[PDB]
Ligand SMILES: Nc1nc2c(ncn2[C@@H]2O[C@H](COP(=O)(O)OP(=O)(O)O)[C@@H](O)[C@H]2O)c(=O)[nH]1
């Protein structure tokens with residue numbers, strides 16, 4: 026039971042997912058053919074959460090792949106672990122997004138969403154007891170922001186109680202991959218605050234720093250950046266796929282991390298992260314995993330947590346370890362750092378301990394932290410939105426697709442209704 | 455006992471039958487010479503239904519082949535499994551149909567039907583206990599529509615209690631193989647509603663979609679289209695040729711599917727239909743066979759069943775399977791789809807389970823469904839008939855063969871008496 | 884002036900003739916995308932008929948009532964649905980019910 030349907034969208038959502046299913050297959054021991062080559066029987070006990078058993082002892086992923094041009098789906102099926110996906114799940118159109126939200130959500134999104142939901146409904150009626158979905162997209166482009174938020178608004182009308190978490194890629198503050206990325210992010214957060222349950226904000230700029238300052242990589246390609254995100258995605262549901270001492274899932278984190286139904290934007294973090302030649306000058310103990318999570322140089326969003334306050338903090342530990350050693354380190358970082366946590370929530374640290382480590386290490390952790398330091402992330406989108414909208418530039422590519430200015434005004438007013446909440450609950454008593 | 459006499463007619467009725475006897479011979483293990491090369495003794499137990507044992511352990515088919523020109527019979531005897539038919543059964547004339555119903559039913563039909571019925575009467579007096587006939591023709595051409603309906607009107611005067619089922623090929627809505635195909639279909643349904651017991655309506659357009667959307671064939675020739683019809687023809691009588699758990703035949707389907715003696719036009723459907731490279735990404739279970747039958751992209755008539763209501767539904771399963779697993783899937787598709795079935799018939803699903811699969815698969819099904827969604831099929835014939843008849847065009851090729859306008863008026867009035875019944879019983883209570 | 888003449892898309896709906904089970908896809912009808920009325924019928928070809936409707940294709944667009952054959956694109960308006968037919972004969976069913 027408790028199955029998860031995986032949905033991908035856009036160019037970035039595929040290349041995270043094409044690395045994500047390479048990590049899941051190595052934890053459960055799946056070849057690129059689709060057979061099984063494990064050693065212990067714990068890998069086949071909970072195999073139904075990400076895999077459907079096909080005929081002939083082959084396991085295929087429960088993945089749904091969406092794009093508007095076939096240029097990125099052609100590289101996914103031809104790469105490694107690309108023969109494992111079912112060929113019916115590759116749903117793709119011929120027009121293309123054009124790096125445009127209006128062509129992703131209104132014009133070419135409507136011609137495709139009736140064919141995608143024939144695959145979502147078929148996979149959801151095949152599972153025994155559905156846990157909840159998950160989505161991998163990016164707020165910068167057109168398909169991951171237009172087609173990605175269109176799928177959530179149609180799913181939530183059909184499944185109003187299942188959880189729905191998105192692994193978004195929030196655009197970096199310094200460099201800009203897209204000229205119109207403030208428009209594609211402002212018109213997407215307006216959809217995510219009313220239709221999701223929890224959201225993982227990831228910045229590209231915070232991932233280039235970890236590969237440069239912490240891991241000391243010379244030439245980090247996207248095979249090295251997306252490998253860190255896929256370790257965090259598996260690290261959230263790792264208490265659902267393996268037996269543990271204190272178990273969690275996608276529902277217990279949606280209760281213990283979200284106190285108000287609009288404040289559900291997180292920031293992720295993985296530990297341990299050692300360099301190539303510095304993984305022998307280090308002891309792998311629980312007080313080493315603790316003091317590597319909470320510092321600012323290990324976050325995945327480009328925002329220092331010292332500017333704000335933590336509301337809720339989740340720490341998902343993996344591997345065999347003493348529970349006294351975990352329950353003391355989480356307490357010690359809460360007493361001495363008593364200003365950076367919040368006052369009106371006592372004991373705001375959630376602990377989850379699994380048993381099976383990732384392939385290669387001895388123990389590992391995963392940091393899922395909420396904060397009011399992401400109000401700096403929504404000031405920079407809202408400042409760059411109002412800098413472009415007051416001249417009404419890059420607007421005839423949006424108005425020409427059947428859109429008015431009131432769509433923008435209610436989008437930016439919703440974001441300033443979100444900034445006035447993180448500033449409100451930061452200064453409570 | 456329970457023998458079946460097979461009758462073919464026209465160009466299309468031969469090339470379905472010449473593929474049909476290639477599938478029956480592979481289930482019973484018959485070489486193209488006519489000998490036997492089986493392995494188990496279950497293939498010779500019920501061999502008498504489609505075969506007469508000749509002298510020297512050779513089995514010849516009980517087939518009667520009718521045409522008006524020798525151009526198509528020359529290709530049947532020269533192809534594979536063409537040496538198996540008896541040379542006396544090739545009854546053919548020298549004139550030719552001319553793609554004309556009046557030359558098929560009145561002028562050249564009368565010069566041939568006295569020679570065909572010398573072969574029908576000889577084969578029917580040689581069987582022990584006759585079950586019923588079957589016919590393969592097409593409503594578009596001249597021989598399959600004129601000579602084909604003339605044989606039924608002469609048989610029913612001689613055998614008033616034996617069943618008589620026709621595998622017609624109803625013309626497609628979009629393209630048109632024949633200019634006068636509304637005349638050859640309107641003047642044939644008027645004969646079939648008074649002289650048959652059940653009729654399988656098959657459209658060509660719904661078979662091109664299955665070879666393009668479901669099987670993913672690049673170049674589907676008629677060897678690939680007629681192979682699907684021949685699998686459905688054998689799938690109806692497959693509970694008569696092999697032992698089973700819940701047995702059916704051509705009589706139990708004629709009782710459980712036909713509630714009124716004018717409503718006997720069906721739509722067929724076969725399952726499973728896998729692609730060439732997608733037959734490994736699929737589990738062959740009973741809930742996979744169920745949800746592949748009832749959707750609209752697997753029918754063989756060009757009409758969506760969602761436009762109307764199912765009166766009766768037959769599902770003939772093949773292969774070893776649990777009866778609890780079949781009796782629950784048929785119930786589950788009846789409770790949740792409670793609007794698309796009819797109200798005044800409770801438990802309108804007929805189940806038949808055989809034991810021996812087709813050659814190559816592990817289990818298979820066959821869908822024999824009645825619906826009021828075929829009223830769209832008779833609106834399009836009646837609209838195209840009245841569009842051509844009100845100008846009285848293409849009429850001197852019919853009136854010149856001894857025919858009046860009252861033959862047409864009582865034909866089209868009978869069809870609108872058929873459309874006013876499917877609209878009547880769709881909105882009952 | 885730089886804020887130009889407000890190139891806007893009409894949000895119109897296109898039902899298809901006879902098919903009672905259809906909703907109508909909202910198009911971006913604008914003066915930028917279709918220079919002539921005859922170019923609008925070309926986009927109606929692929930996105931209305933898929934398997935079962937319209938053998939003659941897309942010829943005669945009627946009103947939602949309908950009693951007026953639509954002329955140029957200036958005969959259209961903003962925010963009204965339309966029925967797309969392909970013959971001189973018009974089928975009178977309830978199109979705009981249950982949008
Ligand atoms: N982390 C990561 N981000 C990527 C990758 N490829 C593209 N992106 C991000 O995707 C965004 C560009 O949008 P795009 O992927 O083309 O989406 P689309 O235009 O909607 O199809 C930028 O924010 C890029 O940083 C990748 O391999 N890894």
Ligand SMILES: Nc1nc2c(ncn2[C@@H]2O[C@H](COP(=O)(O)OP(=O)(O)O)[C@@H](O)[C@H]2O)c(=O)[nH]1
Nearest residue numbers: 464465466469553592594595596597598631676
């Ligand atoms: N499925 C199928 N239909 C066929 C085939 N050959 C002809 N037809 C159909 O037969 C009709 C044409 O009539 P025809 O076969 O010549 O019959 P006749 O004119 O009465 O001898 C059309 O509806 C064709 O689609 C075939 O091999 N397979």
